[PDB]
Write a protein that binds this ligand. Structure first.
Ligand SMILES: CC[C@@H]1C(=O)N(C)c2cnc(Nc3ccc(C(=O)N[C@H]4CC[C@@H](N5CCN(CC6CC6)CC5)CC4)cc3OC)nc2N1C(C)C
Ligand SMILES: CC[C@@H]1C(=O)N(C)c2cnc(Nc3ccc(C(=O)N[C@H]4CC[C@@H](N5CCN(CC6CC6)CC5)CC4)cc3OC)nc2N1C(C)C
Lengths: 303, 303
């Protein structure tokens, strides 16, 4: 097994257990956005079967993230179970998904962590204002893991895709001026990741009613403008299509990004659409304000 | 509340939780007697209501002590509950007792801890040999607590007295040549601690049948000789009398040191008798081999 994974599981278990003893108030204080809990474990000639002997686990702003979970309709006991009852599964930036497919666990940089801290309060207030109804990533936990030498940072989000319904096609859309296209090595996977021109070449249509579309684009408008005002760019719309005829009703309380196709759709389809990859990443590298309108226009045209 | 007490409770809770994930083998390995687990917690602007912000908890030889609990008929979940569901109560060396009166928690020195480590394996093997039937202290856990500056060591033992039945009179007997007597300041308490000459002056009798006496003294003989061979001295026989007429059947599976009075006893009495205070303590200060026979003779005469 992966020792970083077992520290993550141990840590989330420890985190949620600790919070079960902490009183939940309705409001956050400015200090909650600067808070953390740190635990350092040293086992000498003990418990080698389960845990590395020397590890650290640090949770950033535990009260804020608990408040976010609640606002996103997520119970702490359930969150704990999803992350701990069985190991998260790998995919290959690399990521894991909880065994029940409800949550995504992504390894991030210390720079991403700094950026998340920078936006956390404004992010929180935005979620308050929209009552948790948003196409933004739903940030549920943020941690630092140390296992004798190696140090990693992780963030946990709600899965954009369904926890039951399988996805047969997936798009990552930015709407950029610079040409975007998938590679053939990716094509060879069971579920590849297609891009802008794949969509605007294979004549992909999304069959949703005018009401669903209006609601979606209203939501997208606000989300994107919030991202713009934080000077964030290079995020994508993730789009996943579930084909009912191959594998089809979903729970909107769990698969919160799902939209049914309208009645005249050529095939029985369910769409899963959300914004992803919102943090900067100074390892990769035209302005944020331009990026947003450009992103908003493209999604307008394709839908 | 007492922050050292809440670290103890947190630590025992954490300890038992961790062990619930560790496989129980039938046997201990030599390394289990050198093992420990260390956890250091640092909370910044978080969880001030329950815990100090900076503390450490260290458990010595967790596998050995788990094995001892099992051998003493104690379930880990029950032990955990007894120590954590409500705070232990103070008494004033000073000690606490678990809320349900099942366990004693005593603060000890780093010297006592060194001595316990020194005897732990031999102690364990002795308990194996007698199948847990002994008048020795039943050692159940040993810990180190740190709360920002202060460092303390604690050991947990089974209560010599009953967890239901009240005790109206208590003796601490060593059988020493040097005169031993209680003080008047102690007398003024609801339940004082009387000594050798109080017994051998107030004409105290213990009314148990010849079978119970023989069994007791056989047990005492072996226990004391084991203590002698470890070069330990200055331990006492603790004696507590429960008066049924004032407050009377006990569970021998819980109140393991209880002995009913015989049928011709002037009053309905239950006795609780065990050895206590077996470690050296180099702060207090004629040889161990002499001490034992001298202790064994006195208990022979008074019973
Ligand atoms: C965290 C950052 C960001 C973000 O901000 N949010 C909010 C977010 C939210 N949700 C997701 N979900 C997924 C994104 C992408 C995929 C995918 O294409 N995965 C492929 C690779 C592995 C492939 N494997 C799976 C097991 N298969 C074995 C089968 C036989 C049993 C064999 C084939 C399946 C297809 C799947 C997702 O769900 C599992 N991603 C997010 N991102 C992503 C950029 C990582
Ligand atoms: C750990 C070291 C060693 C050892 O090795 N083993 C194995 C061991 C095992 N068991 C005990 N038990 C007790 C020893 C002694 C006493 C006592 O005289 N206590 C007095 C002081 C407090 C008094 N308070 C109680 C609350 N009261 C309030 C009432 C109104 C509600 C008011 C009066 C009650 C009488 C009580 C014990 O049980 C609670 N002691 C041990 N020792 C002792 C030397 C500490």
């Amino acid at each position: 097994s992966d020792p970083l994974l077992s520290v993550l599981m141990w840590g989330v278990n420890h985190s949620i257990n600790e919070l079960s003893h902490v009183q939940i108030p309705v409001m956050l204080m400015p200090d909650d956005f600067k808070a953390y809990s740190k635990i350092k474990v040293d086992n000498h000639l003990f418990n080698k079967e389960n845990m590395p002997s020397h590890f650290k686990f640090k949770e950033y702003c535990p009260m804020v993230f608990r408040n976010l979970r609640e606002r996103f309709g997520i119970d702490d006991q359930d969150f704990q179970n999803s992350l701990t009852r069985s190991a998260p599964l790998p995919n290959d930036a690399r990521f894991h998904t909880s065994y029940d497919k409800r949550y995504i666990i992504k390894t991030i940089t210390s720079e991403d962590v700094a950026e998340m801290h920078n936006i956390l309060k404004k992010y929180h207030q935005y979620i308050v204002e929209c009552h948790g109804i948003t196409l933004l990533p739903q940030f549920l936990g943020m941690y630092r893991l140390n296992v004798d030498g190696v140090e990693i940072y992780v963030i946990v989000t709600r899965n954009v895709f369904s926890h039951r319904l399988s996805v047969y096609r997936k798009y990552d859309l930015k709407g950029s001026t610079v040409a975007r296209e998938a590679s053939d090595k990716e094509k060879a996977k069971e579920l590849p990741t297609l891009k802008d021109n794949d969509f605007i070449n294979e004549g992909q249509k999304i069959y949703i009613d005018d009401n669903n579309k209006k609601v979606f684009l209203e939501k997208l408008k606000k989300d994107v403008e919030f991202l713009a005002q934080l000077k964030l760019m290079d995020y994508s719309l993730l789009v996943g299509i579930h084909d009912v005829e191959r594998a089809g009703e979903f729970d909107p309380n769990i698969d919160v990004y799902g939209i049914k196709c309208h009645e005249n759709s050529p095939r029985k389809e369910v769409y899963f659409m959300a914004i992803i990859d919102i943090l900067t990443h100074y390892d990769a590298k035209v302005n944020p304000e331009q990026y947003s309108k450009r992103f908003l226009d493209f999604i307008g045209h394709i839908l």
